[model samples]
Target: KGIVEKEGYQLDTRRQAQAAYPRIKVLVIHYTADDFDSSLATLTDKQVSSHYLVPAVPPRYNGKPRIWQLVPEQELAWHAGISAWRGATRLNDTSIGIELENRGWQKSAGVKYFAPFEPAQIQALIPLAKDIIARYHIKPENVVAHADIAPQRKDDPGPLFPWQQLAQQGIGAWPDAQRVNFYLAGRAPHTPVDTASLLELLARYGYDVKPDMTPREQRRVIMAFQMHFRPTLYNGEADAETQAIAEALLEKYGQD
Candidate 1:
């Protein structure tokens, strides 16, 4: 049970050339919804695994963070099931996945759920993500959650996740708060808008939006858009704030 031997696979430095897949363009973060012990067990399980396992050790537990390398970057980990991002489906082959240990929240049947993440856990995440983003040259806009990529069916790394902190550290995209405020001030409430045109904007920012789709599909696309862009008040319905945020995101990150 030592650090070096406990894993499904390890990054082999000697075979690193062959082991290093195409340089990653995206880094997807997820929470284990379980503690470190449970997560470590799951990573080694044959049915489930990720490239790295971030343990939720307390600050005082060992005085340093622990990152378990489960799979080499060259090999595609069986994560991001049924995901689509920025028009790319089956994202596992193209993205690097990290699994962090924390009992994330969930709900069912009109019930509520809550689980707090350890500060030590979050502190560990920052440098780890910064390192990956640096090594891969991942676009700031491409640092996403598993939920952002698979919004329709999955919701790990939920709203409680500290996206703003990561963005501040240059690990992901951070909207200029002043710019957002300026735009919001001028926006009207509940204005009638074109869902199709709005979706075009979301698609441009990397949400999986199909050209041929109905209102329901648009809703899902919008929800995915909100999860990443306007997470504070995501209601799955297109509103002035949502639309404004979407427009601003495209304006900031979009290519001409």
Candidate 2:
């Protein structure tokens, strides 16, 4: 859509003089811990906002799922704050954030129960995500969870999020199982790997891990990776599977 005239100036689309590319670099996935109405209100309240929101069971409009668009794709949304990924920081300027309606987690008898995402929601998400991926040429490694970029401060789109399922649909990155096993053979799951080297591999794989951070901060970074890729048991320790996965990721998408 274009305007014909504005302030006595005629609109023109006749010439192609400049060669330009899209600014979008990453696709950050999120989950609203509240209900649909609250999520809508909060995102549109002139504070936090995302480019798109997919409800748990998105209503169908003529057989197509209707997802919400709170902010224009061209505009910046205040979704991920003080975040870093792949040597880049402050991703809000170059990423599109998509929020899914999810209750997040509930506690039961000292145990935390994370709610599972509805199949319908992912069904709605895939196409929307695929379109954005195609249009922006977003790399698989760049598709990440909200918890990924802001490990120390945030946890959304947590462990229950089906990252591998999205990768199967070409929407996100996933480490190869064979490669994982290859690395795992040397060190078994639950076995400890050196913290410094582990953190280095994680940093190479796009997590905001650093060598100079505190032990607690470093643990959170490892936990954030587990929450995204190895959700079964994420205790913030540098276990073998975590190390293997991080190594596999680095092998797959090296240094970027």
The per-model lDDT (C-alpha) reads: 0.73, 0.89
Model 2 lDDT tens row, 143-253: 998989999988788888888888888888898999999999876688988888888888888888765899899899989999988999988888888889888988898
Tell me the tens digit of each residue's lDDT in model 1 across 43-124.
8888877998877764444667667888998788887888877767888888889997878776757654546556777788
Could you tell me how far off, in angstroms, the CA of residue 45 lies in candidate 2 after the best superposition?
0.7
lDDT: worst 10-residue window of model 2: 12-21
Predicted structure 1: lDDT: 0.73
The global Cα lDDT (0 to 1) of model 2 is 0.89
CA-only RMSD, every prediction: 7.4, 2.9
TM-score of 1: 0.80
